[PDB]
Structure formats: C-alpha cells, structure tokens
C-alpha cells in the first residue's frame with residue numbers, strides 16, 4: 483500500500499494537545515526504535531476520509547466519535563479488538579460511543595462537553611439564563627466590556643441553545659425523527675440571531691476571535707471545551723467553569739463528544755498502533771502527557787479519571803454533559819453537521835431567515851434516510867414484483883415520492899431497457915463486491931452534472947433494473963446494499979441541489995399530474 487510500514491503517522495486536531503501526544507510518541511520511539519510522527523492537518527475531519535478512501539493517510543486518526551461511523555461505513559477503519567482486561571480499564575459508556583454495527587471501531591480517549599467559561603473579575607455571578615444576557619451585555623458595555631463571545635462558525639457551540647427548548651438531531655428515547663426545524667430549535671436560533679441584531683454578538687465571531695477576546699479580558703464569558711483551558715491559564719484571566727445558561731427555563735443541552743482514536747484500514751502497522759494506543763497513550767502517564775498540554779476532559783481510563791474527577795472544571799464539564807446527550811455516530815452525522823452549520827451561519831448573517839434556514843437543515847439532515855426509504859422500497863418491489871406491506875412512518879413525502887417514481891420510472895425503464903441491458907453487461911454486477919465498484923464509477927460520472935429529476939429517475943431506474951437481475955441470479959441479499967450505494971452516491975454528490983429543490987417534495991411537485 484501507500485502507507486509506510488514500520489512507522490506510525492498520527493493525525494489529531496489542532497485544538498488538541500498534539501505536542502503532548504508527540505512526547506508519548508517520543509517515548510514509544512525510545513523503547514521500540516520505531517518512528518512516531520504527529521500531525522495536525524487543517525480540516526482534518528474532511529482530509530482523513532479523502533485520503534483514506536484511496537488507501538492513504540495516517541495510521542491513527544483522532545476525532546470525536548460522531549464522525550467514526552461514517553468512516554467505518556466507508557471501510558476506512560480497522561475493527562479494534564482489545565482484550566477483556568484492557569476493555570475493563572475504560573468506562574463501558576465510552577466503549578458504547580465507539581461501537582458501530584456491533585463492532586468497536588476506535589479507542590475512546592476522553593469525554594468532551596462544552597461549559598460556560600466566565601471571567602470572575604468581571605462577572606462574579608454569571609447568568610443562570612440566556613434571557614438575561616442582553617441586559618447584562620448593556621451593563622458591561624458601559625464598562626467597555628461585552629457579556630459573551632463564542633465561535634459562531636461551528637454549530638457545535640450553538641447546538642446547546644438550539645437543543646434547550648426542544649431542538650434535536652435524531653430523536654433519542656429513531657433516525658426518521660429529526661427535530662432540526664421544530665419550534666424549539668427555531669426559538670433557540672432566533673434568540674441567537676436577536677443577540678446579533680441587537681449588537682450583543684457579531685456574526686463573524688469564530689474560534690480565534692472569541693478565544694482572544696476572552697483571554698484578553700474583553701468579554702466576560704465564552705463557551706468552550708476543556709482543551710481551551712490551557713490558553714486561559716497562560717493569559718492569567720481569573721476564570722471559572724460552570725453550567726451553561728438555561729433557555730426558557732430548560733437546560734442548554736450540549737452534544738457530548740468522545741475523543742477517540744481509530745486505526746486506518748489501509749495501515750500495515752495495525753499491531754504497532756494497537757501497542758501505542760493501549761500501552762502508551764491509554765495509561766496514566768500517557769494521558770497525563772497529553773492532558774498537561776491541552777486538557778482532555780473526563781478521560782475514558784478509569785484509573786486516571788479518578789484523579790481528574792476532583793477538578794471542579796471537570797465536575798462542571800460532566801454537569802453540562804449530563805444535561806446534554808452523547809452524539810450519534812450514524813453515517814449521516816457529517817451531513818447533519820454541515821446542514822446545521824450552514825443554517826446557523828445563514829441565519830446569523832441574515833442571508834436566510836431562521837425558519838427558512840432550519841427548514842433547509844431539516845431537509846439536509848433527513849436526506850439520506852428519506853432517499854434510502856424511497857430507493858430501497860422501489861428497488862425491492864421492482865425486483866420481486868410486489869410492494870412492501872410495511873408502514874412508511876414520517877411521512878407523506880415517502881409515499882408520494884414512491885408513487886411518483888413508480889409512475890415516471892415505468893416509462894424510463896421501458897425506454898432505457900436496451901441501454902440498461904448493455905450497461906449491466908458492460909459492468910458485471912454479480913455480487914456485493916461489484917456494487918462497491920459501481921459506486922466509484924457513479925461518483926465520477928455524477929459530478930459532471932448538471933442535475934435534474936429526470937437524470938435521478940434514470941439512475942434509480944437503472945438501480946431497479948440491476949436489482950431485478952440480482953434477484954434473478956439468486957443474489958437478493960445484494961439488493962439492499964445496492965440501494966444504499968445509490969442513495970449514498972446521490973445524496974453526497976447532489977446534496978445542495980436536492981436541498982434547493984426542497985428534497986423529494988420537489989420531486990413530487992416537478993412530475994405532478
């Protein structure tokens with residue numbers, strides 16, 4: 483492969499303690515004579531799947547657990563199998579965070595949650611509510627200070643407020659149940675936008691700007707995670723870490739992340755990586771080395787957390803964590819975060835109204851599951867000649883899109899039968915490994931669009947054609963992964979177009995009779 487044998491390359495995000503991680507690398511190198519190299523590439527969570535998909539990249543990838551399901555689904559991660567004894571050294575719920583389809587796909591490192599960080603000298607008694615921050619800002623502005631600055635370019639930081647009065651991603655209690663554009667999410671975002679309209683915050687504020695303003699004592703509060711504490715320590719600001727403000731009497735609910743370490747599927751150094759992570763990093767001295775660089779939060783290792791738990795900053799971190807929720811690791815978490823990122827930025831800048839912004843994010847977030855429901859049902863009923871008698875769920879969009887697809891797809895399949903026959907024969911889709919090869923082909927072709935619903939119908943119709951063939955040669959098991967592959971290709975390459983058409987509602991209206 484392209485990844486070098488007998489070395490370790492490790493990627494971790496630039497806001498984490500990568501210099502501390504390098505020391506742990508240095509110790510490994512001392513013992514074994516094996517080179518360890520730590521990098522913190524920009525846009526890491528985007529860069530890794532790009533390079534790993536070609537069998538390249540780092541041996542070890544660090545990120546919060548939410549992205550790892552997508553990585554694993556794309557075949558980019560090796561299954562990890564720690565022995566029972568190592569497993570028992572970490573909290574079971576941190577292992578739960580890195581389980582995907584019944585398999586462990588990463589080592590959990592530390593539990594991260596946002597807290598309210600405040601300047602004790604400016605604000606001895608920080609607000610318990612979001613609602614009182616406008617008035618507090620006015621009071622502080624008279625002194626040449628502002629109340630609150632935090633990163634508005636990443637939805638992670640705004641999510642706690644969105645979730646406060648009822649917003650949610652995928653319902654936890656149902657991936658078909660998405661609460662990005664309900665009244666609670668709209669109330670939360672609207673409050674944020676009003677703060678901006680009323681000059682209490684600035685839409686342009688990002689991570690660097692907010693951090694600088696807090697650490698220079700210009701703003702009384704910021705919202706951030708444990709990794710940020712080291713820089714505040716250096717600035718000598720007298721800070722406290724506390725519970726996030728409530729909104730409409732309800733706690734802010736941060737999405738909780740577990741910093742995790744995955745092993746590249748393409749790495750020839752999986753045994754080396756295992757050794758490094760289990761017996762160097764995930765020890766008291768290993769985690770201390772990283773934690774002393776940038777604080778990890780509440781670590782997964784039971785022994786070392788027993789000490790860190792005494793830190794009131796950690797207690798505050800876990801208080802906020804318990805009021806929030808552990809992130810899902812389903813493959814469309816990335817699409818969810820992109821949708822909401824755009825919604826927050828657009829609402830904050832005035833490019834969209836809050837309502838229209840969150841509507842788009844709802845559609846974006848639901849896009850994979852909605853598309854899969856339609857495409858899977860269509861391919862299956864086409865292959866077997868009979869519909870699925872199971873209930874749709876939410877909602878009328880699926881039923882109407884499927885009705886439309888059946889009606890339009892009938893003519894498309896009749897007219898394209900000869901073409902489909904030739905393409906099926908040209909390719910050789912005979913099993914599930916052939917389905918993967920088709921995806922790579924489709925990704926290349928479908929970026930040359932030029933998108934309309936007719937082309938999408940032709941693609942799905944070819945899918946149905948192939949599905950029929952797979953049933954005929956007794957490979958009915960291949961139909962669902964075919965549907966997933968086409969769905970993945972479609973929603974990935976035509977995401978923006980699909981959201982612009984209002985998703986499958988646009989499909990139904992376009993072909994309305």
Ligand SMILES: C[C@@H]1CN([C@@H](C)C(=O)O)C(=O)c2cccc(NS(=O)(=O)c3ccc(F)cc3)c2O[C@@H]1CN(C)C(=O)Nc1ccc(C(F)(F)F)cc1
Pocket residue numbers: 898901902903905923924927928929930931932933934937938939940941942944972975976
């Ligand atoms: C018909 C030829 C066959 N072919 C030739 C060049 C060739 O080189 O063989 C393709 O490369 C080709 C390859 C894979 C998919 C498809 N397309 S297809 O699935 O609809 C199809 C499959 C089999 C057929 F017989 C006819 C259409 C391919 O089409 C192309 C035409 N083409 C450029 C296109 O269909 N583009 C497109 C479709 C959907 C979407 C989207 F994303 F909006 F859905 C975007 C772009």
Ligand SMILES: OC[C@H]1O[C@H](O[C@H]2[C@H](O)[C@@H](O)[C@@H](O)O[C@@H]2CO)[C@H](O)[C@@H](O)[C@@H]1O
Pocket residue numbers: 495497527546547548549594636637638639707739819
């Ligand atoms: O803003 C969306 C973003 O949120 C989370 O990323 C966090 C990460 O978990 C933290 O470790 C820290 O680095 O801040 C990040 C936000 O800038 C999700 O983990 C990530 O997938 C998502 O894109």
Ligand SMILES: [Mg+2]
Pocket residue numbers: 838841842981982984
């Ligand atoms: Mg819209």
